[PDB]
């Protein structure tokens, strides 16, 4: 059973701006998603210090980048704390509202789209390169969920019956047809070294 939700108006406006504005420096999406993975990994590691059983769902803390040219997907997998249903359908949108308004106002003051992560809404930079984003996520003591959106003001959430993840988040970027450079080994490596050089978890770039 699939539930369909409306983005809050401010977040829909942000996604439209990301999709419609001319902006050539699209590669920043990868830094923003890796940063989110790193923050999620930080949090499970921190919480496991007072409750070690939180690592029963998996002790390894890492980030994997997986291109698939046949499916035209770039997938980013981490074993961080994951997201609850409440995060997905209600609570993260509430935090995104204030960040979006601030980011909007910064853009009119002369800020650049690459600063999106300073306003806590860097995830939506995925829409610089993806026509559809599918997010599989598993938080301890909650179900595995699949979040999905092709923008247009709505997203879906369902309980996911695919391959169990144990714990963490998997962001599946269905790339636009003119954005397949982000499937190339040399290009991904270039971007990670330039923008994500000091991330404190092993990042593995899969090849095909
Ligand atoms: C709603 C939403 C928000 C971010 C993303 S992208 C995204 C989210 C996560 C995740 O599970 N997090 C992020 C974070 C930072 C701090 C603390 C805890 C947690 C949990 C990890 C990697 C990502 O690339 C996707 C969606 C669907």
DSSP state string for 17-42 = HHHHS--S-TTHHHHHHHHHHHHHHH
Residue 202 burial (10 A CB sphere; 0-12, 13-18, 19+)? exposed
Q: Which of 96, 102, 127 is nearest to 17 (CA)?
A: 127
Q: Distance of CA 146 to CAs 7, 129, 136, 202, Å? A: 16, 20, 5, 25
CA dihedral 187, 188, 190, 196 (to 10 degrees): 160
50 contacts: CB under 8 Å, gap ≥ 6: none
Distance CA 80, CA 61 (A): 7
Instruction: Give the three-state DSSP class for 148.
Output: strand
User: Which residues is 169 bridged to in the sheet?
Assistant: 78, 137
State the Rg of the chain over Cα. Answer: 17
- The CB of 171 under 6 Å from ligand 1? The reply is yes
- The CB of 119 under 6 Å from ligand 1? The reply is no
Distance CA 108, CA 67 (A): 35
Residue 1 burial (10 A CB sphere; 0-12, 13-18, 19+)? exposed
Domain count within the chain: 1
Ligand 1 centroid – CA 8 distance (Å): 18
What order of strands is seen across the sheet that includes strand 168-175?
Answer: 2-6, 154-159, 144-149, 130-138, 168-175, 73-78, 63-68, 203-205
Ligand 1 centroid – CA 62 distance (Å): 15
> Per-residue DSSP letters for 97-145?
HHHHHHHHHHHHTT--GGGGGGGT-GGGGGGGTEEEEEEEEE-TTS-EE
CA neighbours closer than 13 Å in the CB half-sphere of residue 92: 16
- The CB of 140 under 6 Å from ligand 1? The reply is no
User: Which residues is 6 bridged to in the sheet?
Assistant: 154
- The CB of 123 under 6 Å from ligand 1? The reply is yes
The b/e string for 116-142 (b: 16+ C-beta within 10 A; e otherwise) is: bbebbbbbbbbbbbbebbbbbbbbbee
Structural contact between residues 29 and 43, judged by C-beta atoms closer than 8 angstroms: no
Distance CA 129, CA 193 (A): 19
Distance CA 186, CA 130 (A): 19
Structural contact between residues 40 and 92, judged by C-beta atoms closer than 8 angstroms: no
Q: What are phi and psi of 65, to 5 degrees?
A: -110, 120
Distance CA 77, CA 173 (A): 11
Containing structural domain, residue 83 = 1-208
Instruction: Give the three-state DSSP class for 171.
Output: strand
Q: What are phi and psi of 26, to 5 degrees?
A: -70, -20
């Amino acid at each position: 059973e699939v539930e369909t939700f409306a983005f809050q108006a401010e977040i829909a406006q942000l996604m439209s701006l990301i999709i419609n504005t001319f902006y050539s420096n699209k590669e920043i999406f990868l830094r923003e998603l890796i940063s989110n993975s790193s923050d999620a990994l930080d949090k499970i590691r921190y919480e496991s210090l007072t409750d070690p059983s939180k690592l029963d769902s998996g002790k390894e803390l890492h980030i994997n980048l997986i291109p698939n040219k046949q499916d035209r997907t770039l997938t980013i997998v981490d074993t961080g704390i994951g997201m609850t249903k409440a995060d997905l359908i209600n609570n993260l949108g509430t935090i995104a509202k204030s960040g979006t308004k601030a980011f909007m106002e910064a853009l009119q003051a002369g800020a650049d789209i690459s600063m999106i992560g300073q306003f806590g809404v860097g995830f939506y930079s995925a829409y610089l390169v993806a026509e559809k984003v599918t997010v599989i996520t598993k938080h301890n003591d909650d179900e595995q969920y699949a979040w999905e959106s092709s923008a247009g003001g709505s997203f879906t959430v369902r309980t996911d019956t695919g391959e169990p993840m144990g714990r963490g988040t998997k962001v599946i970027l269905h790339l636009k047809e003119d954005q397949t450079e982000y499937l190339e080994e040399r290009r991904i490596k270039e971007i990670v070294k330039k923008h994500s050089q000091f991330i404190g978890y092993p990042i593995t770039l899969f090849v095909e």
